[PDB]
Design a protein around this ligand. Structure first.
Ligand code: CL
Ligand code: ZN
Ligand code: ZN
Ligand code: ZN
Ligand code: ZN
Ligand code: ZN
Ligand code: ZN
Ligand code: ZN
Ligand code: ZN
Lengths: 54, 52
DNA sequence: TTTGCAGAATCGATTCTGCA
DNA sequence: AATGCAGAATCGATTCTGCA
């Protein structure tokens, strides 16, 4: 589907909905290799690398 | 009135003392429903409103 | 159509400031 | 002058979206 069962928002793709759901479930598949930080989306990890590891 | 962490200046020593918590991580405002803690009163007030 | 990059927009959470 | 409440202003870690 494309509707979030938590917050009711409607998305352009099933693909992004599934990413979106991570924000409610707490799943965070992108692990920082340098510390124990994890992120739901790729952009958050990239930002984390640029600012805490430099 | 000068902070030694970020070099910023503040209007009073009273607020400078509060400001330092942003760096030192001292969080005297404590939620009585969960383990949340805050440096400034407004943060605790916001926390209580939407969460509890 | 489904996946993905990349970075701007968003808005929760916090800091700063007007006034007492 | 020093303390303090309360809300305006700001920030930034994440979500969202133009584009491919
Ligand atoms: Cl304390
Ligand atoms: Zn949702
Ligand atoms: Zn969208
Ligand atoms: Zn890290
Ligand atoms: Zn480090
Ligand atoms: Zn400082
Ligand atoms: Zn709480
Ligand atoms: Zn929360
Ligand atoms: Zn910003």
């Amino acid at each position: 589907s494309r509707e979030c069962s938590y917050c009711g928002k409607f998305f352009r793709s099933n693909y992004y909905l599934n990413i979106h759901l991570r924000t409610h479930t707490g799943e965070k598949p992108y692990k920082c290799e340098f510390c124990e930080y994890a992120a739901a989306q790729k952009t958050s990890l990239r930002y984390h690398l640029e600012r805490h590891h430099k």
